[PDB]
Structure 1
Amino acid sequence: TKKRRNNGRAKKGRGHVQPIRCTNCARCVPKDKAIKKFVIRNIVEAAAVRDISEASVFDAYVLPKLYVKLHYCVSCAIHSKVVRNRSREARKDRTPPPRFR
């Protein structure tokens, strides 16, 4: 049974897309099929921000961010609950979950 119109990936007129490496394991995944996270976080997270702020030698020091991009095979993505299975008609929508918080 043809489960997805596009075969779980984004290859339309290529024929070949280069493979990348998963981050959790080392599974070799085509680049367009992999699930890609782009997390942007501070170095200190939420509770130490006050501690370094008072201990800083500078006045009003803007704490740096940490930009790391993640790649996931389907197995790790399901097992880490970054993505979960949905109902058959709910599979068709492809707007990302809300980004308010």
Structure 2
Amino acid sequence: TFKRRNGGRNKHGRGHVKYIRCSNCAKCCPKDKAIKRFLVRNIVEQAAVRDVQEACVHDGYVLPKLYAKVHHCVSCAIHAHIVRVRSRENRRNRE
């Protein structure tokens, strides 16, 4: 049986897509198949923002954010709850 119509990856009109290394285990997974998330997270969470905001010398200092684009293989993404097993019908939902 064929689980998905796209074969589990986003490849049409190509023959080959370069792979990437999983951020957790370093497994080689093609770029169009890996689970890619762009995380824009703060330098410190809100319980500890103010005791740094009061220790800023400059007025108007904005604490940077860290930006990282994290790839996961299917196994690590499933195990880390980034993606979940869905039902047959809700598998088709790309939203």
Which secondary structure does the structure 1 equivalent of 2:40 belong to? strand
Shift in Å, 1:57:
0.5
User: Partner of 1:84 in structure 2?
Assistant: 84
Q: How does 1:59-74 map to 2 (within 5 A)?
A: 59-74=59-74
* TM-score normalised by structure 1 residue count: 0.91
Which secondary structure does the structure 2 equivalent of 1:58 belong to? coil
Separation in structure 1 between the aligned mates of residue 81 and residue 15 of structure 2, nearest angstrom = 30
User: Partner of 2:54 in structure 1?
Assistant: 54
Unaligned stretches of 5+ residues in structure 1: 96-101
User: Partner of 2:16 in structure 1?
Assistant: 16
Deviations 1:14-42 (A, max 9, x none): 01000110000010000000000100011
User: Aligned residue pairs: how many?
Assistant: 95
* TM-score normalised by structure 2 residue count: 0.97
Question: One-letter code of the match for 2:46?
Answer: A
User: Partner of 2:94 in structure 1?
Assistant: 94
User: Partner of 1:99 in structure 2?
Assistant: none
What RMSD over aligned residues (CA atoms) do the two structures have, in Å?
Answer: 0.7
Which secondary structure does the structure 1 equivalent of 2:60 belong to? coil
Unaligned stretches of 5+ residues in structure 2: none
Question: One-letter code of the match for 1:82?
Answer: I
